[PDB]
UniProtKB/TrEMBL annotation, chain B:
Keywords, comma-separated and alphabetical: Ribonucleoprotein, Ribosomal protein
UniProt cross-references to Gene3D superfamilies, sorted A to Z: Nucleic acid-binding proteins
Keyword Ribosomal protein in annotation: yes
Domain of life the protein comes from: Eukaryota
PANTHER family cross-referenced by the UniProt entry: 40S RIBOSOMAL PROTEIN S11 FAMILY MEMBER, SMALL RIBOSOMAL SUBUNIT PROTEIN US17M
Any one Gene Ontology cellular component term annotated for this protein: ribonucleoprotein complex
InterPro entries: NA-bd_OB-fold, Ribosomal_uS17
Molecular-function annotations in GO: structural constituent of ribosome
Protein name (record): Putative ribosomal protein S17
Species: Toxoplasma gondii (strain ATCC 50853 / GT1)
TrEMBL record, chain C:
InterPro entries: Ribosomal_uS8, Ribosomal_uS8_sf
Transmembrane stretches, start-end: none
Keyword Ribosomal protein: yes
Protein family: Belongs to the universal ribosomal protein uS8 family.
Pfam families (alphabetical): Ribosomal_S8
Database matches in SUPFAM superfamilies: Ribosomal protein S8 (SSF56047)
Organism in which the protein naturally occurs: Toxoplasma gondii
Biological process (GO), any one: translation
Protein name listed in UniProt: Putative ribosomal protein S8
GO CC, one annotated term: ribosome
TrEMBL record, chain D:
Whole-protein coverage range: 103 to 256 of 268
Domain of life (superkingdom): Eukaryota
Name by which UniProt lists this protein: Uncharacterized protein
UniProtKB/TrEMBL annotation, chain E:
Entry's Gene Ontology cellular component terms: cytoplasm; ribonucleoprotein complex; ribosome
Coiled coil spans: none
GO molecular function, one term: structural constituent of ribosome
Keyword Signal part of the UniProt annotation: no
Protein name: Putative 30S ribosomal protein S15
Highest taxon of the lineage: Eukaryota
Listed GO biological process terms: translation
Family, as annotated: Belongs to the universal ribosomal protein uS15 family.
Keyword annotations: Ribonucleoprotein, Ribosomal protein
Amino acid sequence: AFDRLRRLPNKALRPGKCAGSLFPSLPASVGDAPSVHGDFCVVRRADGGFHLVPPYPPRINRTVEPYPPSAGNFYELNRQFKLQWKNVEYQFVPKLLPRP
Amino acid sequence: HYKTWQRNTAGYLRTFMRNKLPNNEMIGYVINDKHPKSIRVACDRFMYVMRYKKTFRYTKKVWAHDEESEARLGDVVRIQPLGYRIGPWKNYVLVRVLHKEPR
Amino acid sequence: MQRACEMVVSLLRVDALSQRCPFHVLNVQILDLLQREGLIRGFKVDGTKIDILLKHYKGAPVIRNIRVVSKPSRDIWLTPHELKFRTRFNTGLWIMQTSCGVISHRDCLRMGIGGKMLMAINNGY
Amino acid sequence: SSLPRLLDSELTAIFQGAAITVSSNRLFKALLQSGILDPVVEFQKLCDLYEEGRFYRTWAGGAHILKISGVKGLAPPGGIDGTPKHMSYEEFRTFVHAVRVWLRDERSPVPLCDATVRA
Amino acid sequence: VALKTRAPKSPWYIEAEKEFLNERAQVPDAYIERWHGEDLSKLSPALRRCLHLRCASSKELHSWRKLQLCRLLQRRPFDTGSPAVQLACLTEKILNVRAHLLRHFRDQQKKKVLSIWLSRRHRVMKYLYRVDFNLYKYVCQQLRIKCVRFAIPDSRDRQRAISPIAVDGDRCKFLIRQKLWKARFRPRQLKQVDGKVVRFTRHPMEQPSSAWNLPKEHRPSLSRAWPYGVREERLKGNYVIQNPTAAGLGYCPAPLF
RNA sequence: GCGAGAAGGGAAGUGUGUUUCAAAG
RNA sequence: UUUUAUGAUCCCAGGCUGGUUUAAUAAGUCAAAGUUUAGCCAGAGUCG
RNA sequence: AGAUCAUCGAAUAUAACGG
């Protein structure tokens, strides 16, 4: 058994806890405190304000095939999200979920 | 999983206390000290059975970390958990050594 | 612990006056509690073995039934509030092994500490 | 004082000579042979700083375990491949910069990395 | 269809077997029953020849060897119950039975007795290791016995467990290990020069190298085998082996006989 | 301008869950 | 160098828990190895 | 953040790394 297609569990956007922290100043339990924002990010609005925004593609799980068989008739599969700025491009398309 | 009435019996409470230690600490003996600054601590746990009312034992081998590399093979030590992941195998930190085997 | 369970066979005899028993530290303490209740006439440590006398009344012995609860392969523990349910409406004698020595079941409930049921004397179902 | 500036072009020969991605085993030995870092730095010195710097986690070196094992690799060892992180050109540059200063500040009167201390 | 038959004996196995018997038959210049010159002076020269070791029997010859070895590890005169003396006494008894089995091969009753002594000696080492560690190492060097430490429980795998038969690896070079023949490690059939085809139940006994489970110099590296590198002690090549009597992967301990 | 999957069983076995603690973006 | 009968490699299926009263000197002080019905947690992405 | 028996389908076991 080599180079076998495995499967990983799904995971949505984890909501942050109200009782969070910015930076743990020398914590004195055996763990890491949660975050308020969590996955979400704060950006500048068009009208001079601050609002939430869906971040860059949140770990698009490519291991599991699409559920609805009729997905190609309305959506183009096998997409890529590249980041370019003038003549500079960075390699960050691989969205891997590391171990806990 | 244990039922509500199973959390008040003396058999379950006694087993819990033995397993439970400050800072979720554990007791075990080192069995492998080949890699640099690495030692594999073998910890022994306990569990309760509500059917026959008997407690058994099962070993739990885990990896630890040592700074001064004072511990050696066949030496009971103390481990402490951590809220992160360091290295491919390292998941614990040493505190002290209780017993030392001659050479 | 194994030697403790070997005392019931010797003490549970009808046509006998005195029976021997292996010497043990824990066994000596158990005999003291039984003598207080008036179940054993007396005992003497004869070196490697202990000679224990038997009490009789109108032919039949004072001890009629012995039940071993605790065994070397496992350990029975009951909370102070659970021992009362087990032991109720009975005249039996339960040996309780608490942290502060060995006492009977009646004293265990008085202190409210969690003991250990070792054996039963003059117990039914 | 007056720390020399490491030219980008010079590092290209060392990175390509030891050979896109390459393993970290061949790069550690080649760094000392070129003598760019200059006592003599031993092989264990670089290995110790690599783990202490927490580079395996930062770079996501453990992501390759799930490709072979899958679900079994998520759990800890006791609750497994252990290959080193294959640093790329970009990644290697950063590490060289980080290790170059960690040796100079080890004997400087004014620490730069960690100047503070808790009682 | 292949026929199951015994495997041929290797050329080196026969040569070593004859050498072992030669050593056991050596008769040094000494005396039996502690017949010191004090008492022997009262006897005639003619009569003294009979009392020499050359004229002694096997029982007397074997007993003399025990006395010489016992004195080497004697704590006090007239003391044989100490673990140090018992360790040497048992070693001489095992070889005495092994030599007899070579000449006599139809004595199947004594095959079971040899196993009892081999296991009994193993337990002695375990007890002596915890009570005295310095003395345990000294006795092994004098007798050239493979020292083994007991610090962790032995695993259930036979490829890495202990083997009481191969304890005296230095003195015996043909009872160290062998090959597996259970399901997949069986030998392939072959044709001899006989007009017939035969198959061997047991694999041939090869000659192992001298560096069997011995330390060696390692090279620093960082790969899968050494995620955290190589220790300084390993590079010099002086680490102490916990189980030197391990057969290793793809190997099995040698039979009893 | 604000709210809206309030009709979701397709993924996973040592996982999903439970329990003990902790959290001044 | 590492796991391995205290199950390592490996094939198919099953998602975890709570729910008040409840007779009998089994008078339960939490329904006594395992039985449920409004409920908690949790359940990837895409207009190129 | 720590700990946290596995079961059914009869069964068929040693595998992956470096000289």
